Symmetry: C3
Subunit: 126 residues, 3 copies
């Protein structure tokens, strides 16, 4: 109708991870499988900023996160790795889905890790 607003659907390939552009698949999978052997109780995570976000960027992309660490605990870690105000927000995006903070990184990894053994998380304040 004229008074309804038709909500547009977000483009699922809007977020492009630089780590996937610069490294071919076989190199990434070989790297992720080695890190899984060295740290079987940790999960390799790629964290990049959404290009539209205006909060600070990350010095390092790659993180070895323990499986029992929750998403909420990982949220406070990433905040203390970028330049932002205490009042600024930050949201994690895994396949454009904000994961529950009560879930562990191991549960989030086991459900959404890609074929290169890496879990890709985008962050943005908007």
């Amino acid at each position: 109708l004229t008074e309804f607003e038709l909500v547009k659907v977000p483009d699922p390939g809007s977020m492009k991870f630089v780590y996937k552009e610069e490294h071919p698949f076989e190199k990434r999978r070989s790297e992720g499988e080695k890190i899984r052997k060295k740290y079987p109780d940790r999960v390799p995570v790629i964290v990049e900023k959404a290009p539209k976000a205006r909060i600070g960027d990350l010095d390092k992309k790659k993180y070895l996160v323990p499986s029992d660490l929750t998403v909420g605990q990982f949220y406070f870690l990433i905040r203390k790795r970028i330049h932002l105000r205490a009042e600024d927000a930050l949201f994690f995006f895994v396949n454009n889905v904000i994961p529950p903070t009560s879930a562990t990184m191991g549960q989030l990894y086991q459900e959404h890790h890609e074929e290169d053994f890496f879990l890709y998380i985008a962050y943005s304040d908007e």
Copy 2:
């Protein structure tokens, strides 16, 4: 005891939706059923501000939200439809319950939509 605080229970009919006051039930249900036929993969949502909230109001009440859109994605949409600061918060309330942002609007609709085929969401910063 004297040192305990007895937490009061929030009145479940504190939130009154204006769309339900101005339109009788048969008119709302006939409107919601038509919009479900025209857009079977979308859900009609009524979004109104809690009267006590001091953040900006909504120009439009009615939204046709795709079923696969998550609550978190719908959260960013409503923020970009009202006047508020980047530091201001916003929370959705469905029957005075804050829905999980990881849930899809279709799942939220199928569980809480009323008899007029509409899903009612209240928002407030407090």
Copy 3:
């Protein structure tokens, strides 16, 4: 690797509740069991601030929370019991785990209450 960051694991006994230090177990359990008899549809909750948090402290530690109250509703209650700005954040921690706001306090109590019939919640903005 040199480019990975090894995420440290948070000390689970970092948070010490003052209510447990000042009162022995038998006194706390006897207090919690009495309050469960007087209010079978309410749950006793101990809320204390994490020492590292810079937001305001709580005048009262002990709260009798109805079982059907959600964590999100209890979140707004605690905000209106301390000195903080509208832009300041606040997070609940139960065993260093941020509980889902959609869960009820009764569900959260039944899963995480300790042997003294009390549910211990820590809060902090960081």
